Ligand binder design. Structure first.
Ligand code: JMM
Ligand code: JMM
Lengths: 412, 412
């Protein structure tokens, strides 16, 4: 019968910092992690900025020997995973290694490595492709390498649900624990899509902000002058743990994971429906799963990508689900500061939702100078808002019409 | 408690055929689908052959214009999915569409599209990258496009666990039904990795057979002259359905899905342990999940990839799990005929396991001319073996040490 799931450890790389506390400091200060990209020449591209991880030192985590085999998205996912395991205080033993698994996902995986190898193939032939090309680029190798390095023998898998990946990974990993398939899961996502193919591909779709001359102002969820999402890199990982398992070892518990929803829009390959119908179905599934009155929701970490259609769909969904209570809750987009970490967005936003519960503060939506038509909720414009938060919801929506919602609440 | 899950529809593209019955006729005749790869200059490559899908006509499923947006692996996954839904006779309505979801996966997704868009980017710059590059290449777009086309609003996700994908996809979809999160799921996997990048990438790891002179003899699981796997393309999809839901509409039930195991080896990025400890844990987990004694197993569809270490690991795991019963079951590798469909392997092999139950016949391991040291089980060498089969297992092992086992039983 269904067990309770709590969060005992968190880990992160983001455009705002190389761990959770540094990133969260940035979030509560309204700081932008968006800047012109330095790691390649984008003069031919329509978008030349994004949210890069700054000063990542893989030698805090991995031998130079292992690191050279791995795409940046795998390095970032292992960094966040290792942080989360250390933060949890969990000791892996022969007694518990079969009950600890991992589900770290990605939207696009090792696109930098794949591009570099494609260049080698075309210019120099197949004998110049790296022997590590497949295992060093494939999405499941965060799960795989973490399992090998820590000796985790529980369920081992990876999701890829585009911009919903991190939210789905955490929710499904919680179900594994709830249903008795594991006692502990490391779950989240990682992404590093800032190669020519990534910036070029989203650029070809005209999906990205082109505010090159003012990158920190580009991500402006619900602002009338928004012109698309900002591409960002990084990782989030949580240690999810069965409640009695955590209590038995005297774990520090950040919060309880009480609800998870999924739904499909069944609408369009890339566009969310204007009325947010699929997002509303997803949130209602999540709130029913948590056994909650919708009026218990205090804070929503929105998907809030800074696209014209997505941002207004989310207002329409939140009004549909919460009715008059839509005017009492606080909803913000931390993507205003971090940009869109794609498959890692739901993982870092789950962590920000847990810290909102820990610190009783709604992070701001920076850049919200002129809320658009109908964007008249408490969107925490400009500055962090201390407030009572017992229940926090984190939403994600992705290509293929795929929706996820996590519901967290305070634990005492 | 848990609801029962049955298989009511199946769909496939394989190197043996453009549907399930043609593919299965090839399997029971011991036919090879392996041949030199056409319309591609593989002179510079150490492997020049594989399992291609022959004569696929996407316009039976999609308009030319919608097909142009999608990588071949997505086309293949949608073909199998549409076949499976047609075969099930399910009618989607407003009363059930929130209870019908999708989990179609892939191991390495849209290599062909990545190759072609790299070519554009390198020769012409980023403004010639297709607008459809991202949504037409990402792994979750089989689930996405299928849900849009059929109006499915249930759980919508995608796994990517390398060579384990199709097995994990089916098993997790069965959990969604068992635990009441859906009444129907379409689940399975698809793969098209015969580009330069797939053959080049696996070739750089020296993982592939190089038997260019006799491609039909290349895939020879447990044979002493095996020299690595054969890369193949295609897709498998099953309609999974709650038992009372299937009985109520008079569905034709192929078999029951009674068990699912996962485990991580935590051993090595690409190599399984010689003793098959991880595969043994996974099979024991799946039999425990089914409430079955090892003695009740009649037929195993091995992973049986034709690699030196993988094939012998599986013999060790089967001896370990089954003890005095290990010689009484039959175990075969249909990869001897189909080659290795990577993330689609577990999907087509689940279908072959279900048909072994329907037809009371173990498919052959072709090319097993000289069994290797210790390969002394009943590996169904050369020719199909009619026999009693009440319980059939299908095993998958992949990069990262990820394992999956499905347990099927006859239904009456
Ligand atoms: O949790 C870990 C960790 C686990 C295994 C190896 O490192 N760390 C150390 C590395 N960190 C930093 O460098 C902080 C940014 C300053 C973050 C905390
Ligand atoms: O989803 C994507 C993608 C990148 C750009 C557009 O879509 N990728 C591709 C490459 N993949 C792989 O597994 C690597 C090849 C080995 C799967 C994930």
């Amino acid at each position: 019968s269904r067990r309770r799931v709590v969060i005992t450890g968190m880990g992160m790389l983001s455009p705002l910092g190389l761990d959770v506390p540094s990133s969260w400091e940035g979030i509560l200060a309204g700081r932008s992690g968006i800047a012109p990209i330095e790691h390649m020449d984008l003069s031919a591209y329509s978008t030349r900025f994004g949210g890069s991880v700054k000063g990542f030192n893989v030698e805090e985590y991995l031998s130079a020997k292992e690191a050279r085999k791995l795409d940046l998205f795998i390095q970032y996912g292992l960094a966040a995973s290792f942080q989360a395991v250390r933060d949890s205080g969990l000791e892996v033993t022969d007694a518990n290694r079969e009950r600890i698994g991992v589900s770290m996902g990605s939207g696009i995986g090792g696109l930098t490595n794949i591009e570099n190898n494609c260049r080698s193939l075309f210019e120099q032939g197949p004998r110049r492709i790296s022997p590590f090309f497949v295992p060093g680029s494939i999405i499941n190798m965060v799960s795989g390498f973490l399992s090998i390095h820590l000796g985790l023998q529980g369920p081992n898998y990876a999701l890829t649900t585009a911009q919903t990946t991190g939210t789905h990974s955490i929710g499904m990993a919680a179900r594994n624990i709830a249903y008795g398939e594991a006692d502990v899961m490391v779950a989240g996502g990682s992404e590093m899509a800032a190669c020519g193919l990534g910036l070029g591909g989203f650029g070809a779709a005209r999906a990205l902000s082109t505010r090159n001359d003012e990158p920190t102002r580009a991500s402006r969820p619900w602002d009338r002058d928004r012109d698309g999402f900002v591409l960002s890199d990084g990782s989030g990982a949580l240690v999810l743990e069965e409640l009695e398992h955590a209590r038995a070892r005297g774990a520090r518990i950040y919060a309880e994971l009480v609800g998870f929803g999924m739904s499909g829009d069944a609408f369009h390959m890339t566009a969310p429906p204007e009325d947010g119908a699929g997002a509303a179905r997803c949130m209602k599934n999540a709130l029913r799963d948590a056994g909650l009155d919708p009026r218990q929701v205090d804070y929503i970490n929105a998907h809030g990508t800074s696209t014209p259609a997505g941002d207004i769909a989310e207002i329409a969904a939140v009004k549909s689900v919460f009715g008059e209570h839509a005017h009492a809750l606080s909803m913000s987009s931390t993507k205003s500061m971090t940009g869109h970490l794609l498959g890692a967005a739901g993982a870092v936003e789950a962590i920000f939702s847990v810290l909102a519960l820990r610190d009783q503060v709604a992070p701001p939506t920076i850049n919200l100078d002129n809320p658009d038509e109908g964007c008249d909720l408490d969107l925490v414009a400009h500055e962090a808002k201390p407030r009572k938060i017992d229940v926090a919801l984190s939403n994600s929506f992705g290509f293929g019409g795929t929706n996820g919602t996590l519901v967290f609440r305070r634990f005492a």
